[PDB]
RNA sequence: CGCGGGGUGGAGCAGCCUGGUAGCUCGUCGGGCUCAUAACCCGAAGGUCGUCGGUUCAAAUCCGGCCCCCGCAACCA
RNA sequence: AGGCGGCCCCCUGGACGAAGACUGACGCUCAGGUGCGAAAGCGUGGGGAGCAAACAGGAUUAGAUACCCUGGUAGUCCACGCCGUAAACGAUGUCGACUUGGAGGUUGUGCCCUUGAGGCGUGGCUUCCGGAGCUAACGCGUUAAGUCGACCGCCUGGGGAGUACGGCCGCAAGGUUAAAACUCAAAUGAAUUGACGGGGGCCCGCACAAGCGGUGGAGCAUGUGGUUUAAUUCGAUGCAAC
RNA sequence: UGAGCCUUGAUGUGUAGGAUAGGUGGGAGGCUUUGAAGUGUGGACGCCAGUCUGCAUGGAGCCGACCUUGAAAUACCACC
């Protein structure tokens, strides 16, 4: 929008735990509209992580996210012919979302036999900082670092 | 070896490249570092942050010579005009003189022609 | 603009003072002017324009 | 033939220089990025490290023959 | 006038003014004529840091004899000459006279108690706004493009062409004077409404960004086109036809 | 300011590990008043672990196979 700045719609928390973040993650996972399948998958992923780690299902979710989220993000300015990809401070609201999206992408990329299992594995990787999403985050940070020069 | 308490720090702040050079009270170098010589090219070369980085590098280099107090010579206008000085302050050198030695000609030498863009 | 640091004075303040001194001098502006050679005619035209602007 | 130095990912150069150790310039692909070829980063495939034996816990790293490329002076019926 | 900016000396021109003194029209313009005349160039001799035609390489580029970068000769600097052109432009000849103004600035100067930087006014010089007026309007506007006078210079559609030829000048470059044929119905000038600008300002749209899925790759449906057929009814053709 | 050398002092982390173990022969003790633990440190190197000392303070002890290791004491050492 050129003109409109509006307060965003209310999203209801997760049925099992009571988390908006979880709901957001599920939404991100879901396309075509199939939420209940996606939600189920997410639950399954959580379960396996709990079975592996021996920790709380939400807390583990949180630290994985922490491990995959960046503080600085590049953005193109397009003033000249050469690329002016300036790094900008990312707000805590959308940072989470971006991380979730990255996780989803990584899961999609992965080749484990169950989709729930795939994302569980991704989460595990994030926890031990070795997966695909984390790698992506790392180079994003590196890219920002290189061009942190600009303001 | 050949340790010095305080020395001059030439910053050649230009439109293309910022040069940091640490030399003796009278004029004898010990170590220098450039923004282009820190792993930055073109658009990243002429940069305040890059200049700062260069300054830091220079400071790191010259720490073997036992320098405590500092004076800075400023040459030309560039993106790293005060950032460089801030960097060196951070590095922990007690600044005494912020000297400006900008090469202003007194209407003598002919400049080159205008860049038509 | 040769600038010396006083006792009981922060670095930031000193920097600010230096900046002010530079501004007073107009060294950067001079450099800009001299960066490329200006034809006398062009300079005169610029001066005229400035004068015109002054009148409001 | 005598002597000296080298065979290092696809190429050249460091690692030998006195055993405990595969890096550099590119090249190739993929990803990010740009209108982009490019510049730039991240990631990866790619080397009996001339060949072989010996000393030794440990060698491309020390040595011995052998092969190849170069340099060296040398006489050449 | 062209122009001329570090500083200091020498030589020297002129301007402007103030009180006064004197000459007594000595005034104005100027055909021809003479001198001065930015730049670049030309000539011998110097001088040569930078800059910089040309020139070279790199780029850029469809190409790039360019713009951009790195370089780089002539030239730019002086000496005495030539050249004699500039958008030499206030695009307003030169001089002389007169007509409501202001804001100033600049450069002086003389009175009134300067009672203080200042005050009274009151003369010369330049800048902007603008009244009368004027003009095609734009605008100019006591420094006129206003109201008069003098005197010159020059124009008479554009192009051809400020060129040819000839002269005169020039070392040369060329300059100066200056046509004709033919050709066109316009050539312009100001301003106005527009549109447009890879001008400026403002705002706005899923326009970008941020994102979500596509198509484009495959098969299938369909529609076009193209080719083909005896006939492939005809129309629709950027969006806004498929 | 480079070149050697008689010479005297430095120097040696594969990971096991007391931690900066070059090896080969003589030894279970050498060093001490040609002054032992511990303390301030100058300068160095450095793998930042610690390693070699200069000088002051203190005035009677640090080390040895140790548990480890392909190699054992820098408990003494020569050939280098
Ligand atoms: Mg008389
Ligand atoms: Mg000239
Ligand atoms: Mg000449
Ligand atoms: Mg050039
Ligand atoms: Mg060229
Ligand atoms: Mg003329
Ligand atoms: Mg002129
Ligand atoms: Mg004229
Ligand atoms: Mg006016
Ligand atoms: Mg002519
Ligand atoms: Mg298709």
Q: Which domains does chain A have, with CATH numbers?
A: 20-147 (1.10.455.10)
To which H or E segment does residue A53 belong? Answer: helix A35-53
Are the CB atoms for B21 and B29 separated by under 8 Å? yes
Number of separate helices (H) and strands (E) present in chain B? 2, 5
CA distance A24 to chain B (A): 37
Dihedral angle sign, alpha carbons of residues A105, A111, A117, A121: negative
CA distance B114 to chain C (A): 5
For the record, the structure tokens of A14 come out as 């997760």
The CA distance from A111 to A125, in Å, is 14
The CA distance from A57 to A46, in Å, is 6
For the record, the structure tokens of A26 come out as 């599920």
Are the CB atoms for A66 and A100 separated by under 8 Å? no
Tell me phi and psi for residue A88, to 5 degrees: -130, 150
Task: Tell how far the Cα of C47 is from the centroid of ligand 9, in angstroms.
Answer: 20
Are the CB atoms for B9 and B72 separated by under 8 Å? yes
| Residue extents of the structural domains in chain C | 1-56
Strand A72-76 to B6-13 pairing:
unpaired
Q: With touching defined as 3+ CB pairs under 8 A, do chains C and B touch?
A: yes
In C1-56, beta strands by DSSP E = 3-4
B17 lies within 8 A of chain A by CB: no
Residues after which chain A is broken (C–N above 2.5 A) are none
Q: Which chains touch A (3 or more CB pairs under 8 A)?
A: B
The CA distance from C45 to A32, in Å, is 67
The CA distance from B36 to A10, in Å, is 51
Are the CB atoms for B17 and B79 separated by under 8 Å? no
């Amino acid at each position: 929008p050129r003109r409109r700045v509006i307060g965003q719609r209310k999203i209801l928390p997760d049925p099992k735990f009571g988390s908006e973040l979880l709901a957001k993650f599920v939404n991100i996972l879901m396309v075509d509209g199939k939420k209940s399948t996606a939600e189920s998958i997410v639950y399954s992923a959580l379960e396996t992580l709990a079975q592996r780690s021996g920790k709380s299902e939400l807390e583990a979710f949180e630290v994985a996210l922490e491990n995959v989220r960046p503080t600085v993000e590049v953005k193109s300015r397009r003033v000249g012919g050469s690329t002016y990809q300036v790094p900008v401070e990312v707000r805590p609201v959308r940072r989470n979302a971006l991380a979730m999206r990255w996780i989803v992408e990584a899961a999609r990329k992965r080749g484990d036999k169950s989709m729930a299992l795939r994302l569980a594995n991704e989460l595990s990787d994030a926890a031990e900082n070795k997966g695909t999403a984390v790698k992506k985050r790392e180079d994003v940070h590196r890219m920002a670092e290189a061009n942190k020069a600009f303001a | 070896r050949k340790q010095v308490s305080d020395g001059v720090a030439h910053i050649h702040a230009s439109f293309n490249n910022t040069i940091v050079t640490i030399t003796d009270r009278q004029g004898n170098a010990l170590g220098w570092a450039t923004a282009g010589g820190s792993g930055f090219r073109g658009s990243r070369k002429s940069t305040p942050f890059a200049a700062q980085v260069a300054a830091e590098r220079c400071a790191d280099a010259v720490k073997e010579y036992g320098i405590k107090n500092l004076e800075v010579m400023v040459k030309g206008p560039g993106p790293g005009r005060e950032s460089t000085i801030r960097a060196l302050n951070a590095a922990g050198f007690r600044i005494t003189n912020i000297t400006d030695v900008t090469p202003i000609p007194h209407n003598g030498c002919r400049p080159p022609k205008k860049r038509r863009v | 603009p040769v600038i010396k640091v006083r006792e009981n004075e922060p670095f930031d303040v000193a920097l600010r003072r230096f900046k002010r001194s530079c501004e007073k001098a107009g060294v950067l502006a001079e450099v800009r002017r001299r960066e490329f050679y200006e034809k006398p005619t062009t300079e005169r035209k610029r001066a005229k324009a400035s004068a015109v602007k002054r009148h409001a």
